[PDB]
Design a protein around this ligand. Structure first.
Ligand SMILES: O=c1[nH]cnc2c(-n3cc(C4CCN(C5CCCC5)CC4)cn3)nccc12
Ligand SMILES: [Mn+2]
Ligand SMILES: [Mn+2]
Ligand SMILES: [Zn+2]
Ligand SMILES: [Zn+2]
Length: 457
């Protein structure tokens, strides 16, 4: 067996005026949608981006998936063409149900999915496609290519809802990141089949995500609001402890399939939706989500960060430190990069960055005072943004260092963040050097530039 479908998530149907600005729309729906974690957006009937591709020229390496509840799976970063994958996907679904592919009820596929993942006797293996856009397999949305585009492609080129543009818009904050973060700024393409699934997870740095289904059979989603994140994690720790062990890298992250009825039994609020072709699903910061595909389909997704997200982004990095989890980027480095470009920032963006920068400065001031009281006296300015990431992680908590770090000449290249001064080596702290990006005197004028920009209006 029995599956009790969770209640439906909110469905929004914006008008052309409401739809025009994705960021103003996401802010409007936020009080409702953040209570459910996920929501569905039906674009105006006439917003129809053109989907065109040669199924024989689009190639990808499929990923093999075992369908077992509570079994550890890895989040990862053979060859089929889109045609041969489709033939395989259709033959599979039609042979599974002994029915024509389009006649299988969605409620049946859902009930069946939850039955097959819980039955030990069932050894069902599926395949899917998951990767960033490339020359072998590109974006489902129109992109500018040096290739004459049709007027139908031209009108959707600059759309805020074309997922290639969403990151580089001025109401976004990940836009400004100069560092190589391919996984978080570039759209991901997903080629699905019946029962291929995405395990329970949250986005890196508790970011938002937006997902468009270009074509094919529906994608079923389950979502949990951000406020219930720790409640969900506590349920998962009891039922699957193996998933919560410390991992060697970000590549080695462990995720699992878990029946939403198990979460619902433990008082975790869960919402569902069937996303159909031409619809968007938006996930809110720290909102757990999972789901599976109903059949052969093609989706495109991207992470994004609004001004609303900035304080949660800072709380996330603090949460990664407590867990010894690797960061994708330095949150402080992003803030300082935006401060250095205060003159060209959006006014609402400058105002919000200024507020996070004030917290960063006061926390930094307190951390430096504490390390000075531990006996660290020597200091030297260091341009942390020039170091590759693997060369600036705290030995203890793995945090990406930017504002400051502690080094000792006895451990060349090793760094600790200012929370872990006692974890570097056995030398007395007078042998240490405080490496800093900026003095407090450099920071106050950077924050003032944001204030001037924000007060202009
Ligand atoms: O339809 C979906 N298919 C696959 N994956 C999905 C998914 N996510 C995948 C990632 C990874 C991106 C690459 N990095 C690791 C994390 C984050 N979310 N969320 C929603 C929907 C889907
Ligand atoms: Mn099974
Ligand atoms: Mn996701
Ligand atoms: Zn640390
Ligand atoms: Zn030492």
């Amino acid at each position: 067996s029995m599956f009790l479908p969770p209640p439906e998530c909110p469905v929004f149907e914006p008008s052309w005026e409401e739809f025009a600005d994705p960021f103003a729309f996401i802010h409007k729906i936020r009080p409702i949608a953040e209570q459910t974690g996920i929501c569905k957006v039906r674009p105006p009937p006439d917003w129809q981006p053109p989907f065109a591709c040669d199924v024989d020229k689009l190639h990808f390496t499929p990923r093999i998936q075992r369908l077992n509840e509570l079994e550890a799976q890895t989040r990862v970063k053979r060859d089929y063409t889109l045609r041969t994958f489709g033939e395989m996907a259709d033959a599979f679904k039609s042979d599974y149900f002994n029915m024509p592919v389009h006649m299988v009820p969605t409620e049946l596929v859902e009930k069946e999915f939850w039955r097959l993942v819980s039955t030990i006797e069932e050894d069902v293996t599926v395949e899917y496609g998951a990767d960033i856009a490339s020359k072998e397999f590109g974006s489902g949305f129109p992109v500018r290519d040096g290739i004459k585009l049709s007027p139908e492609e031209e009108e959707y080129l600059d759309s805020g809802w074309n997922l290639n543009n969403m990151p580089v818009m001025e109401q976004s904050v990940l836009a400004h990141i100069t560092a190589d973060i391919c996984g978080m700024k570039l759209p991901w393409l997903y080629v699905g089949m019946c029962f291929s699934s995405f395990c329970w997870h949250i986005e890196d740095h508790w970011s938002y995500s937006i997902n468009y289904l270009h074509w094919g059979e529906p994608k079923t989603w389950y979502g949990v609001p951000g406020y219930a994140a720790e409640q969900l994690e506590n349920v998962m720790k009891k039922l699957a402890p193996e998933l919560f062990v410390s991992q060697p890298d970000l590549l080695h992250q462990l995720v699992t399939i878990m029946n939403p009825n198990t979460l619902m039994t433990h008082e975790v609020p869960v919402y569902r939706t069937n996303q159909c072709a031409g619809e968007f699903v938006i996930t809110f910061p720290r909102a757990y989500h999972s789901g599976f595909n109903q059949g052969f389909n093609f989706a495109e997704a991207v992470n994004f960060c609004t001004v609303d997200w900035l304080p949660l982004g800072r709380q996330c990095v603090e949460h990664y430190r407590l867990l010894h989890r690797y960061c994708v980027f330095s949150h402080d480095e992003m803030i300082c990069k935006m401060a250095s470009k205060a003159d060209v920032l959006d006014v609402v963006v400058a105002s919000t960055v200024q507020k996070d920068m004030a917290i960063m400065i006061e926390d930094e001031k307190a951390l430096r005072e504490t390390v000075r009281k531990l006996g660290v006296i020597d200091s030297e300015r260091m341009d942390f943004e020039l170091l590759p990431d693997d060369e600036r992680q705290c030995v203890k908590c793995k945090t990406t260092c930017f504002m400051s770090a502690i080094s000792c000449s006895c451990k060349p290249g090793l760094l600790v963040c200012l929370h872990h001064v006692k974890e570097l080596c056995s030398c007395p702290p007078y042998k240490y050097k405080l490496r800093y990006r900026y003095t407090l005197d450099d920071l106050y004028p950077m924050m003032n530039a944001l204030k001037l920009r924000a007060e202009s209006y």
